[PDB]
């Protein structure tokens, strides 16, 4: 099942933040898994278990007390030892079946604005080139790349046109969901 | 830092105005599901996930944490409150707009600090309620937040578009208008 | 300092009802809670009866209670209540208040005992 | 409501002793079983949360193990103010317990 990280338990108006993000970093599929437990004060993280140290390290002095109490206790580091596989690792072969395996195919197209955009529109994952018969280059604008917060990316590239003989302009699109790169001409 | 992906397998978060809470799972910058802590319910934010379980109880028991710690840290800093960020609202729609062929408008509100905001829309000066829809605070690396809001339109000639936000670092409504 | 007192314990008829109250004190419920009613027979296992979220109101109850038993609370007055109603000498119990069952630094209550006899 | 059962119902054991009692639960709670101690008259003292044996203070004796379905608590070295009623419990909003694990002295 989903398996959450615990936290480690502490010994106009006004606000106090508490966040504490279980994170979990994957390289190489799983040849390379990092949990980094972050605890923070408003936006200033205070403490955090490193997979790759091996145990609570005050990152900021409000963070010293719980860092070296919860190197004390014997129980909550071989709990956040562990929470590498029974966190990240256990939680990751539920992503290979499904995130992992998500992908939806941009839709390319190119029209002029107030100069042509090509726009590649419902996208994911993030991974892609846009590029646009020789490889024009100086002349290309790319906006950074848009997260649509629904699952689906977005991105805008513009080329400064300056036209002749009918020569074509050409959309030329990579991605990991297309098994053959997108061309669009104009 | 580097890695060939990033999840977070507990946003855990607890402020005290409310108070108030949110757990949520994210793969990737993107959220997974969120756990409505009143109804004590996994609701996916993704189809292809709802073959999972998380148990809502998870959720409430890291709160209750989460409430400890953050008392304990109120008084060891000798009570600090949270600085207000300027939040960055940025308007655009889903895909190429084309006359009389639906979208969604998408309203980012970037850089949220603390997570206590209010997202809504106008057509043609007055509130809009049908279509608005919009996802959970999202965790940034430097520890703020970000909320995106939704509008399904049926883009028009005439009409116009607002995205109104309030948080306590602007000092009045910011109204981003949408342009075709 | 931070305690829950039970109140309303006694001999009840079958057939007859019961409200049950559990002042706390040394907290507010206004900060968001989990209150929960734990009965325990005499002499038998603790059993869980119902939890109310002091923040939102969210109550959830036991499998057994079928529309008999009914939690509430007042933040104002800082009191939870559980209207023991059609009961039976079956639900002769201890009746425990707790607050957040299961974190650390959470207390429990001494009881209030209800009698369930004709 | 999530079931879960004691491994001894009841136990005789001598001071000095190691005692295990286990809990299984109906469904994966994860690792979020707690470890519950009633002397009589009074209400229950929390012993452990998640499987850290952890209070302003709890004996360093009791340890917790499990995740999952299968639980244990683990008495290392019994001391005679541990002749006490064992329960697991899961659940702040929908509370479980189990049926109770007796210690008692052997002779």
């Known amino acids: 099942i989903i398996q959450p990280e615990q936290p480690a338990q502490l010994p106009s108006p006004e606000d106090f933040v508490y966040q504490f993000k279980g994170m979990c970093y994957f390289t190489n599929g799983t040849e390379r898994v990092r949990l980094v437990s972050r605890s923070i004060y408003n936006r200033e993280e205070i403490v955090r278990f490193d997979s790759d140290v091996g145990e609570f390290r005050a990152v900021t002095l409000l963070g010293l007390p719980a860092a070296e109490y919860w190197n004390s206790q014997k129980d909550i580091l071989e709990r956040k030892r562990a929470a590498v596989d029974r966190v990240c690792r256990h939680n990751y072969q539920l992503e290979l079946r499904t995130t992992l395996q998500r992908r939806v195919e941009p839709t390319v197209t190119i029209s002029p604005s107030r100069l042509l955009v090509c726009s590649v529109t419902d996208f994911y994952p993030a991974q892609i080139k846009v590029r646009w018969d020789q490889e024009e280059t100086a002349g290309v604008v790319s906006t950074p790349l848009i997260r649509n917060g629904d699952w689906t990316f977005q991105i805008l590239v513009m080329l400064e046109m300056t036209p002749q003989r009918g020569d074509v302009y050409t959309c030329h699109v990579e991605h990991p969901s297309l098994q053959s790169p997108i061309t669009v001409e104009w | 830092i580097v890695a060939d992906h990033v999840a977070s397998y507990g946003v855990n978060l607890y402020q005290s105005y409310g108070p108030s809470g949110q757990y949520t799972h994210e793969f990737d910058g993107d959220e997974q599901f969120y756990v409505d802590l009143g109804r004590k319910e996994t609701v996916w934010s993704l189809p292809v996930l709802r073959q999972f379980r998380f148990d809502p109880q998870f959720a409430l028991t890291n709160i209750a944490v989460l409430k400890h710690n953050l008392n304990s840290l109120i008084k060891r800093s000798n009570s600090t409150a949270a600085t207000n960020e300027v939040p960055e609202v940025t308007v655009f729609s889903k895909s190429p707009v084309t006359l009389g062929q639906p979208n969604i408008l998408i309203c980012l509100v970037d850089n949220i600090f603390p997570p206590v905001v209010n997202i809504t829309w106008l057509s043609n000066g007055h509130s809009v309620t049908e279509g608005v829809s919009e996802t959970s605070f999202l965790s940034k690396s430097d520890h703020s937040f970000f909320k995106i809001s939704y509008l399904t339109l049926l883009p028009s000639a005439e009409e116009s578009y607002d995205c109104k936000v309030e948080h306590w670092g602007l000092d009045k409504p910011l109204l981003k208008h949408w342009e075709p | 300092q931070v305690q829950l007192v039970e109140s309303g314990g006694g001999v009840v008829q079958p057939g007859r009802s019961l409200r049950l109250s559990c002042a706390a004190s040394?907290?507010?419920?206004?900060?968001?809670?989990?209150i929960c009613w734990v009965r325990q027979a005499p002499g038998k296992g603790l059993e869980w009866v119902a939890c109310?979220?002091?923040?939102?109101?969210?109550?959830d109850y036991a499998s057994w209670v079928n529309g008999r038993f009914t939690i509430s609370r007042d933040n104002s007055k800082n009191t939870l209540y559980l209207q023991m109603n059609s009961l039976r000498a079956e639900d002769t119990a201890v009746y425990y208040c707790?607050?957040?069952?299961?974190?650390?630094?959470?207390?429990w209550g001494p009881g209030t005992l209800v009698t369930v006899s004709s | 409501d999530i079931q879960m059962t004691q491994s001894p119902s009841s136990l005789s054991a001598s001071v000095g002793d190691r005692v295990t009692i286990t809990c299984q639960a109906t469904?994966?709670?994860?690792?979020?079983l707690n470890w519950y101690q009633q002397k009589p008259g009074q209400p229950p003292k929390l012993l452990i949360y998640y499987a850290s044996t952890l209070a302003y203070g709890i004996p360093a004796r009791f340890s917790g193990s499990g995740s999952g379905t299968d639980f244990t608590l683990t008495i290392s070295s019994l001391e005679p103010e541990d002749f006490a009623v064992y329960y697991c419990?899961?659940?702040?909003?929908?509370?479980?317990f189990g049926q109770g694990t007796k210690v008692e002295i052997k002779r």
């Open positions: 040394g907290f507010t419920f206004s900060s968001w809670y989990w």
């Open positions: 109310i979220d002091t923040g939102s109101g969210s109550i």
């Open positions: 469904q994966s709670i994860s690792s979020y």
């Open positions: 419990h899961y659940g702040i909003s929908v509370v479980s």
């Open positions: 707790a607050r957040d069952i299961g974190i650390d630094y959470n207390f």
